[PDB]
């Protein structure tokens, strides 16, 4: 509230609420991804667990943003959460590509908020994004790109399968 609020624009407050919505939508997407891979007719438990852990990470991201909104004296406002873009997610390849697209969209929202913070001369906001969000997204996206390459290699060819097994079983 107005008792503590200092150098915290209405533009940033609003964008923070919208980012919270995006992270919770992402978390819901990952919940859907996770339970799809849990289906008896899909049955890739490691993929289910990968996506379910991401759902938790995304929710934790929204919660840190909400805590920050209150620390700055803004008002947390919650919007409807849109259901995920698909009801069935295809193969592991299709799923990881959708995951990367999703993370890139969050990453772009983080950068757009960083840009707003910079235009509003709000260094606390930039510091907050730097310390808790930007590097984490870069690391996750790298890990997903890695996974995508390995899925493609494995599902593509027996040269691919061969190189994977040597790396994973011998090295």
The span of 42-50, 87-95, 104-112, 140-148 binding Au ion (CB under 5 A) equals 42-50
- Using the rule CB under 8 A, is 60 a contact of a copy of itself? no
Tell which positions 72-101 bind a copy of itself, by CB under 8 A.
Answer: 72-73, 75-84, 87, 91-93, 100
Kindly write out the interface string for residues 99-118 of this chain, putting x where it contacts Au ion by CB under 5 A and - elsewhere. Answer: ---------------x--xx
Site size for a copy of itself, by CB under 8 A? 94
Q: Give me 76's structure tokens.
A: 């947390």
Alpha-carbon distance of 171 to 168, in angstroms, equals 6
Alpha-carbon distance of 118 to 123, in angstroms, equals 7
Residues 6+ apart with CB under 8 A from 87: 32
Contact 73, 16 (CB under 8 A): no
Q: Would you say how long the chain is, in residues?
A: 171
The span of 7-15, 32-40, 105-113, 144-152 binding Au ion (CB under 5 A) equals 32-40
Nearer to Au ion, 24 or 110 (CB): 110
Q: Give me 165's structure tokens.
A: 């097994």
Binding residue ranges: 53, 56-57, 60, 63
- Using the rule CB under 8 A, is 11 a contact of a copy of itself? no
- Using the rule CB under 8 A, is 36 a contact of a copy of itself? yes
* Residue 80 CB-density burial (10 A; 0-12 exposed, 13-18 middle, 19+ buried): exposed
Provide the minimum distance between the beta carbon of 17 and a copy of itself in the complex, in angstroms, as a whole number.
Answer: 11
């Amino acid at each position: 509230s107005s008792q503590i609020r200092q150098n915290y624009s209405t533009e940033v407050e609003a964008a923070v609420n919208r980012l919270v919505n995006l992270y919770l939508r992402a978390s819901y997407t990952y919940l859907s991804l996770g339970f799809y891979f849990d289906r008896d007719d899909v049955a890739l438990e490691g993929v289910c667990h990968f996506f379910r852990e991401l759902a938790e990470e995304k929710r934790e991201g929204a919660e840190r943003l909400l805590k920050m909104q209150n620390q700055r004296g803004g008002r947390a406002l919650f919007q409807d959460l849109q259901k995920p873009s698909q009801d069935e997610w295809g193969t592991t390849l299709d799923a990881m590509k959708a995951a990367i697209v999703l993370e890139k969209s969050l990453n772009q929202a983080l950068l757009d908020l960083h840009a707003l913070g910079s235009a509003q001369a709000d260094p606390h906001l930039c510091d907050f994004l730097e310390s808790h969000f930007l590097d984490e997204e870069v690391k996750l996206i790298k890990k997903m790109g890695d996974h995508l390459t390995n899925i493609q290699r494995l599902v593509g060819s027996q040269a691919g399968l061969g190189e994977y097994l040597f790396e994973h079983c011998t090295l």
